Nucleic acid binder design. Structure first.
Lengths: 74, 93, 74, 105
DNA sequence: TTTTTTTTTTTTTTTTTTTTTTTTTT
DNA sequence: AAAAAAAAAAAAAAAAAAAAAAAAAA
């Protein structure tokens, strides 16, 4: 369960400087996959942080502790 | 506004993905964590977009292709292997 | 005082995938300048972090607090 | 090994640069921070090198030039300005090279 | 006046120079 | 740790070879 192609297309077009810009179908497909990996990494890393500090659930404190390395990795 | 709707769509998909991870690992995510990942994903897209556009433009192309994307994902090696495999698979269609 | 050209040349050649790759003299010069800027930024940003948290010296904790943004900037 | 000594050379230079910042800003750097910066710089060279080689390759050259490097330093605008300045200066140093060599004209 | 030969004028190929980038040695 | 040489590629000039214009015949 992940992102729709049309969704990712709209998200990117919001931010292009040049309105000429388009996205190839294969590129769009790879971006759908990349965004899933990003989200799942954030989630999985947060879970590892929560586990590591012996917390009862994944809370914003843990997420925040995992953000710095996540961002370097992306 | 336009960006608000896009963030909501990202949040929905992020929620889906995190829910799948949660059910797999038998550990819950707080609603705030889901929201923060969605926000981070939205913010990350600005950086991804600008870089992709510079990679394409730097090669004198107006259309961003798979090589630009793979270049973008150069940073962790398990991720790079993951991506290349997927690229060959998409090409098989 | 900064990097020697020969040093930067050796550092880069360690990592080239294609052994065919060489470095032009002007490019090498600019890289020497760029690496200085990188190091000085790390140092200066660490000093600002230490000052900001009122530390007596720039310790690893402050450096680590400055790394995330440094890396995004480079 | 080879890379160990390259790391030591990087650490030495990083130490000198950080010493200059320390003396200038009147705040010390721990030895650990110096070592961390050296480690990061060594690791960062891998990313720099691969990117530079791809940029050169990308434009069908075997020699990485100033344009590839400036492209690499694109990310912060203060940085980009600094680098371009330096390049023109370096070229100006190059003119002196022309002055050195004898000219038939 | 035409069509190849002789002197000057032009052309391309090889060799050598002349620079460019990296590595070695004291 | 710095400086110059060694190694490799690039570039320019000198040599070689043919045709055009001008002269000379049939």
């Amino acid at each position: 369960s992940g992102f729709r192609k049309e969704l990712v297309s709209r998200l990117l077009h919001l931010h292009f400087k040049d309105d000429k810009t388009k996205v190839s179908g294969d590129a769009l497909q790879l971006m759908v996959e990349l965004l899933k990996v990003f989200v799942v990494e954030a989630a999985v890393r947060g879970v590892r942080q929560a586990q590591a500090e012996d917390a009862l659930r994944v809370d914003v404190d843990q997420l925040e502790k995992v953000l710095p390395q996540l961002l370097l990795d992306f | 506004s336009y960006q608000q709707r896009l963030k909501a769509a990202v949040h929905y998909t992020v929620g889906c993905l995190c829910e799948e991870v949660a059910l797999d690992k038998a550990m819950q995510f707080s609603k705030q964590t889901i929201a923060a990942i969605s926000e981070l994903t939205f913010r990350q897209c600005e950086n991804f977009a600008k870089d992709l556009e510079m990679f394409a433009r730097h090669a004198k192309r107006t259309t961003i292709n798979t090589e630009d994307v793979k270049l973008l994902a150069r940073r962790s090696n398990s991720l790079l292997k993951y991506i290349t495999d997927k690229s060959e698979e998409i090409a098989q269609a």
